[PDB]
């Protein structure tokens with residue numbers, strides 16, 4: 076069961092969502108990031124440290140933005156066959172954690188954009204507004220994040236998270 080604090084890390088952002096991995100580190104999907112604006116979470120762009128690639132975007136802020144959070148481990152994808160949870164929040168407030176069996180890490184063409192990502196089979200679907208939602212699994216006690224929601228197949232039964240370098 077994902078605890079409340081873990082859900083409180085999922086945060087609206089641009090056209091979708093992102094995830095506070097630590098008090099200073101926030102992750103999302105590159106394409107949900109809102110273009111042509113000058114500040115994120117009240118800080119000016121000049122004060123944030125961005126690493127973007129493969130549709131996976133990483134923000135490192137100067138100050139603690141979520142002092143209340145304990146840092147958790149951010150992997151590059153997760154082992155094949157790992158059953159993950161996608162911590163989806165809807166605009167309405169509803170929480171919808173989705174179980175997903177993860178397949179392999181692969182480069183992928185998706186609408187002309189190159190995506191470093193990991194496919195997964197759903198075990199209830201996702202929707203266009205869900206990009207940026209974290210993929211997580213419990214590794215004993217600590218919770219591990221391995222990706223952010225980025226795409227779904229025609230049917231909607233297979234999904235894809237962008238993963239780090």
Ligand SMILES: *[C@@H](O)[C@@H]1CCC(=O)NCCCCCc2nnc(o2)CC[C@H](NC(=O)OC(C)(C)C)C(=O)N[C@@H](CC2CCCCC2)C(=O)N1
Nearest residue numbers: 106185186188201202203205206225226227228229230231
């Ligand atoms: C977040 O922005 C969004 C997530 C969508 C989602 O999780 N589920 C949609 C449910 C399926 C409805 C049926 C449908 N309608 N269009 C599509 O599927 C195709 C969407 C597209 N996938 C795709 O092209 O996959 C292949 C056809 C198999 C190659 C897709 O997921 N597009 C995402 C935006 C892209 C992602 C890469 C970076 C540029 C933008 C998308 O809509 N994601």
Ligand SMILES: [Cl-]
Nearest residue numbers: 080081082145
């Ligand atoms: Cl937590």
Ligand SMILES: [Cl-]
Nearest residue numbers: 079082083084
């Ligand atoms: Cl919450």
